[PDB]
């Protein structure tokens, strides 16, 4: 059964913390970071938490976080908070797939016209940032009461309690509205080359763990990276743990030989994937995070022109930083966005993570946000 | 009217949708006795988070147009989300500017030690015991003569530079109200050329 | 060209036309010795005005892009004309930025209690004898040890952030040379969020 | 014999101080704010000094200073100093009529091809700021030697000593390259209206002290300010101390009657002058100086929107301040430049000085730098 990552953002005094706890206890009576887990009939969930714009944004880079969707918690009694703009702003930035809303503390408001209003506000607010403010589902309830009830009756179920039914209305909204992630093996093929040698009479062979997609024999492939040109041939065999394989799929530690490929024509760092799928580049934009001195990062800061190492999977290529206008110097611990240019072309794509180092020592780590040249 | 009065209103005071209605009812449906209610009520919310922790925030600054005076100011909030908010931003810019002009010596009152306050407080009753009324009268004489002093040297007690009608602290409390996060002034720095 | 020589040498080091000729003369008509001579010589000039009073200047500042660190710095010169000059301006911007990163403790060395360092030195000679080192051996280390210390806490002795090859003081002296007015760093201020 | 104000600007270590001294002693032997005086055959001179940019502006505003021309002193040995740009910049700002140059310490430079260079530098620099860098005269000499000689022989004269002759070269340059300032009575007529009253049989009359120009009877005149339109008529009589005057001239306290002017068509604050000489406006730009608290000025600062009283001669008018970009708040003691809009139109002209006050209490003082509307 499918797995998904969801997070909670919004003012803390609005109960996002309480709502999280209510969701666990409520589904418990139907299905036997420091994240929490809970599952519906359809999927399984893990809860992320967004306390910091930076804090989070940092982790989104170090591979840690990966919200497939998020829940917005606003108190119907107060209505949106100025920061609410900033909460949403983050989502836009990291680009959360979709958002769902939960108007908490609805029991502390007599007039139901205000509620329609509060909702009116929020709806528009999201529209301001490309989100389908109208298409988004807005649940009204009270996390507190829903929880107090689950505390009294841990086995409470659907239809029984009024406030718990609202929590379900929400759980349901998630299942639906929320697109389910797009699986890996379904994505175009790709594998990072680690080693390359030969097996006399067989041909030139290259090992590595498949990252995404599938691949059998006779399949047509491309060798992107390092070289002046992207060579392309065809697979002449697959084999796991040195024992022929039917098909190799994402997550498989494999090895592959190619047709019309000398031993000198391929090596570690390079990468092979579905033809036309990804291309080689040298200039790009990226969001980074510099390790503090304690985390073993640099001791001082640096400026435009910095020329370090960027570990891209198996490789470790050289390039020069270009701090943008407004950014004059960068210090350890910083979160930044600058352009970069490398000496040799590399298979690059938005979203691609990497690392930086000064002689093996990792000093920073980021992810590609835009391709330029 | 209905949410139209409340709207236009909260729209301005940026407060709690329900707290807005509450105040319109609570004081007849007239803005003046409402916004002033909201302001007055906000002052309370402030004192509630008064001891909440705040290590987030930014460093505000003000550099006079003639570069002869510069000010640094650490403004902390609870979450960096808030820190990034236009309101926090402005409050900070405005606080820095204020300091530049008002030149406070302390942030808050408690920031003031005893031996210090005393070495002073008596220089107060020293000249009072002279021009007439002895100690008893001069002890209560030097009761309001201190309030004035604090309004001078203490940042919080100073009358806001963009509205002498409200004290700095108030300006802050007001913000806290519309945001919901304790907001504190950690420290400030002020350089005036050749001074 | 002989002309083009000075004419472009002066253009770079921005120094006294005649002084340029002199250097080229004084050191064979080749840059390296020349520019190095100009440099070597500018330091002296600088030393000639060290005691000259300078109450003009501006308040330089640097606010990190992420607003987590801010710096104030009072840079004085003799005349306000100079204060307005692009070079003074830059020097100040640059000094501010440097402090932001290097976080010095003092401006100059004398700014430090002489016996405090004097104590700290024998404190260095201590650990050397303590680790199997003879007196005379351990005496030497103390210098390179103290020297290192000053290069850390003292702004002037710090290696300039945009050219670790030259010490801050040097950057300053260099400016003084091209301008002709004593330039001093009165004081600085640095705030790092939650630090 | 004509009188003129000249000043010296430049690096102090270039000898502007010494040169000043040299000029006094040198003319001495031919003619039988800290200032010195000396006179040629043609005119009489007084020396100003520019030690501060900001400071000069303040005095220029508080009517003290008034340079009819200025001398730039640069050492031929060093050549220009970076601040030289700043020196010149000030001149442009205050708008010095003309500039003359003196290349001092010329005895300390062997190659004469060098001097030509230094001079070409300077010439260009002034061009950069509208000054006739090519038309301007550049004298080469040594203030020091010239002085030493005067010390030895206080009676030295033209032709006798080589270095002194250069100083004369300069004195002459001054005499020629700086036209003489139009006298007040020579400038176009103008008189600020103080009081008004009708004198049955004769007509409506207006008093005031002539600021500039002269005026007899039958002279055509205009009434500018306050009114929606500038009215125009003719002088029907002039009188000082109630005893007919043939002609009234600058600095005279007089009274004047006009033709076709009702007692209500004129009043205090208005001003009458040579037709076409000046017009009414409400929005303008100006250079100001705010009085420090100690000088009685404000206690705090102010921002755009400030609405004080602006006094123009005899009047008092209300207007609002518009701080420009870069200027966010103004504090006592400042020197600033901002635009201003008044409630009623007033006879305005570049250079027109004025004052600002908060209830009779003078808080600032400035001069008009640009007319906008």
mmCIF file of N, CA, C and O in Angstrom, chain C residues 109-143:
data_model
loop_
_atom_site.group_PDB
_atom_site.id
_atom_site.type_symbol
_atom_site.label_atom_id
_atom_site.label_comp_id
_atom_site.label_asym_id
_atom_site.label_seq_id
_atom_site.Cartn_x
_atom_site.Cartn_y
_atom_site.Cartn_z
ATOM 1 N N UNK C 109 46.249 46.913 18.809
ATOM 2 C CA UNK C 109 46.905 46.152 19.857
ATOM 3 C C UNK C 109 46.929 46.882 21.190
ATOM 4 O O UNK C 109 46.574 46.316 22.218
ATOM 5 N N UNK C 110 47.351 48.140 21.173
ATOM 6 C CA UNK C 110 47.420 48.925 22.401
ATOM 7 C C UNK C 110 46.072 48.919 23.087
ATOM 8 O O UNK C 110 45.973 49.182 24.281
ATOM 9 N N UNK C 111 45.033 48.624 22.321
ATOM 10 C CA UNK C 111 43.690 48.571 22.867
ATOM 11 C C UNK C 111 43.652 47.519 23.981
ATOM 12 O O UNK C 111 42.707 47.479 24.771
ATOM 13 N N UNK C 112 44.694 46.690 24.054
ATOM 14 C CA UNK C 112 44.777 45.610 25.052
ATOM 15 C C UNK C 112 45.693 45.850 26.246
ATOM 16 O O UNK C 112 46.802 46.340 26.091
ATOM 17 N N UNK C 113 45.266 45.449 27.449
ATOM 18 C CA UNK C 113 46.111 45.646 28.639
ATOM 19 C C UNK C 113 47.445 44.914 28.493
ATOM 20 O O UNK C 113 47.494 43.684 28.501
ATOM 21 N N UNK C 114 48.525 45.681 28.379
ATOM 22 C CA UNK C 114 49.873 45.134 28.193
ATOM 23 C C UNK C 114 50.347 44.000 29.114
ATOM 24 O O UNK C 114 51.190 43.189 28.717
ATOM 25 N N UNK C 115 49.829 43.941 30.338
ATOM 26 C CA UNK C 115 50.253 42.889 31.252
ATOM 27 C C UNK C 115 49.348 41.691 31.113
ATOM 28 O O UNK C 115 49.664 40.604 31.599
ATOM 29 N N UNK C 116 48.215 41.898 30.460
ATOM 30 C CA UNK C 116 47.269 40.820 30.232
ATOM 31 C C UNK C 116 47.881 39.929 29.163
ATOM 32 O O UNK C 116 47.774 38.704 29.207
ATOM 33 N N UNK C 117 48.522 40.562 28.192
ATOM 34 C CA UNK C 117 49.173 39.816 27.141
ATOM 35 C C UNK C 117 50.493 39.355 27.724
ATOM 36 O O UNK C 117 50.950 38.253 27.463
ATOM 37 N N UNK C 118 51.108 40.206 28.530
ATOM 38 C CA UNK C 118 52.371 39.845 29.140
ATOM 39 C C UNK C 118 52.182 38.607 30.007
ATOM 40 O O UNK C 118 53.076 37.768 30.126
ATOM 41 N N UNK C 119 51.013 38.497 30.620
ATOM 42 C CA UNK C 119 50.736 37.351 31.459
ATOM 43 C C UNK C 119 50.538 36.160 30.541
ATOM 44 O O UNK C 119 51.130 35.100 30.750
ATOM 45 N N UNK C 120 49.722 36.360 29.510
ATOM 46 C CA UNK C 120 49.416 35.319 28.523
ATOM 47 C C UNK C 120 50.636 34.757 27.804
ATOM 48 O O UNK C 120 50.593 33.643 27.300
ATOM 49 N N UNK C 121 51.716 35.529 27.742
ATOM 50 C CA UNK C 121 52.932 35.068 27.083
ATOM 51 C C UNK C 121 53.656 34.072 27.978
ATOM 52 O O UNK C 121 54.054 33.004 27.532
ATOM 53 N N UNK C 122 53.850 34.412 29.243
ATOM 54 C CA UNK C 122 54.525 33.459 30.091
ATOM 55 C C UNK C 122 53.614 32.259 30.178
ATOM 56 O O UNK C 122 54.053 31.148 30.445
ATOM 57 N N UNK C 123 52.335 32.495 29.921
ATOM 58 C CA UNK C 123 51.351 31.426 29.942
ATOM 59 C C UNK C 123 51.667 30.495 28.763
ATOM 60 O O UNK C 123 51.302 29.315 28.768
ATOM 61 N N UNK C 124 52.365 31.034 27.763
ATOM 62 C CA UNK C 124 52.744 30.263 26.573
ATOM 63 C C UNK C 124 54.070 29.572 26.814
ATOM 64 O O UNK C 124 54.280 28.442 26.382
ATOM 65 N N UNK C 125 54.972 30.278 27.484
ATOM 66 C CA UNK C 125 56.281 29.747 27.807
ATOM 67 C C UNK C 125 56.069 28.605 28.801
ATOM 68 O O UNK C 125 56.885 27.688 28.914
ATOM 69 N N UNK C 126 54.955 28.659 29.516
ATOM 70 C CA UNK C 126 54.659 27.623 30.493
ATOM 71 C C UNK C 126 54.526 26.270 29.815
ATOM 72 O O UNK C 126 55.368 25.397 30.000
ATOM 73 N N UNK C 127 53.473 26.116 29.015
ATOM 74 C CA UNK C 127 53.171 24.874 28.306
ATOM 75 C C UNK C 127 54.287 24.285 27.435
ATOM 76 O O UNK C 127 54.233 23.103 27.077
ATOM 77 N N UNK C 128 55.287 25.095 27.091
ATOM 78 C CA UNK C 128 56.400 24.628 26.264
ATOM 79 C C UNK C 128 57.421 23.866 27.107
ATOM 80 O O UNK C 128 57.865 22.778 26.726
ATOM 81 N N UNK C 129 57.802 24.447 28.243
ATOM 82 C CA UNK C 129 58.725 23.794 29.161
ATOM 83 C C UNK C 129 57.982 22.569 29.681
ATOM 84 O O UNK C 129 58.570 21.515 29.899
ATOM 85 N N UNK C 130 56.675 22.745 29.870
ATOM 86 C CA UNK C 130 55.763 21.708 30.355
ATOM 87 C C UNK C 130 55.736 20.489 29.440
ATOM 88 O O UNK C 130 55.388 19.388 29.867
ATOM 89 N N UNK C 131 56.078 20.691 28.175
ATOM 90 C CA UNK C 131 56.058 19.594 27.221
ATOM 91 C C UNK C 131 57.440 19.138 26.746
ATOM 92 O O UNK C 131 57.593 18.639 25.628
ATOM 93 N N UNK C 132 58.444 19.311 27.601
ATOM 94 C CA UNK C 132 59.788 18.885 27.262
ATOM 95 C C UNK C 132 60.559 19.843 26.389
ATOM 96 O O UNK C 132 61.408 19.425 25.610
ATOM 97 N N UNK C 133 60.269 21.128 26.508
ATOM 98 C CA UNK C 133 60.979 22.110 25.710
ATOM 99 C C UNK C 133 61.848 22.983 26.608
ATOM 100 O O UNK C 133 61.426 23.386 27.699
ATOM 101 N N UNK C 134 63.081 23.281 26.160
ATOM 102 C CA UNK C 134 64.011 24.111 26.935
ATOM 103 C C UNK C 134 63.519 25.545 27.002
ATOM 104 O O UNK C 134 62.742 25.969 26.154
ATOM 105 N N UNK C 135 63.967 26.290 28.005
ATOM 106 C CA UNK C 135 63.553 27.682 28.149
ATOM 107 C C UNK C 135 63.678 28.481 26.833
ATOM 108 O O UNK C 135 62.670 28.897 26.269
ATOM 109 N N UNK C 136 64.906 28.681 26.349
ATOM 110 C CA UNK C 136 65.177 29.433 25.111
ATOM 111 C C UNK C 136 64.386 28.996 23.860
ATOM 112 O O UNK C 136 64.169 29.790 22.942
ATOM 113 N N UNK C 137 63.991 27.727 23.815
ATOM 114 C CA UNK C 137 63.220 27.190 22.691
ATOM 115 C C UNK C 137 61.799 27.700 22.872
ATOM 116 O O UNK C 137 61.211 28.280 21.962
ATOM 117 N N UNK C 138 61.280 27.489 24.079
ATOM 118 C CA UNK C 138 59.931 27.890 24.468
ATOM 119 C C UNK C 138 59.706 29.406 24.451
ATOM 120 O O UNK C 138 58.561 29.870 24.398
ATOM 121 N N UNK C 139 60.786 30.178 24.515
ATOM 122 C CA UNK C 139 60.646 31.619 24.496
ATOM 123 C C UNK C 139 60.184 32.023 23.092
ATOM 124 O O UNK C 139 59.245 32.804 22.942
ATOM 125 N N UNK C 140 60.819 31.455 22.070
ATOM 126 C CA UNK C 140 60.495 31.753 20.668
ATOM 127 C C UNK C 140 59.045 31.502 20.273
ATOM 128 O O UNK C 140 58.377 32.372 19.712
ATOM 129 N N UNK C 141 58.579 30.292 20.546
ATOM 130 C CA UNK C 141 57.212 29.885 20.250
ATOM 131 C C UNK C 141 56.182 30.907 20.740
ATOM 132 O O UNK C 141 55.212 31.215 20.046
ATOM 133 N N UNK C 142 56.407 31.420 21.945
ATOM 134 C CA UNK C 142 55.523 32.401 22.553
ATOM 135 C C UNK C 142 55.263 33.559 21.608
ATOM 136 O O UNK C 142 54.151 34.076 21.539
ATOM 137 N N UNK C 143 56.287 33.978 20.882
ATOM 138 C CA UNK C 143 56.107 35.077 19.953
ATOM 139 C C UNK C 143 55.160 34.678 18.841
ATOM 140 O O UNK C 143 54.138 35.322 18.624
#
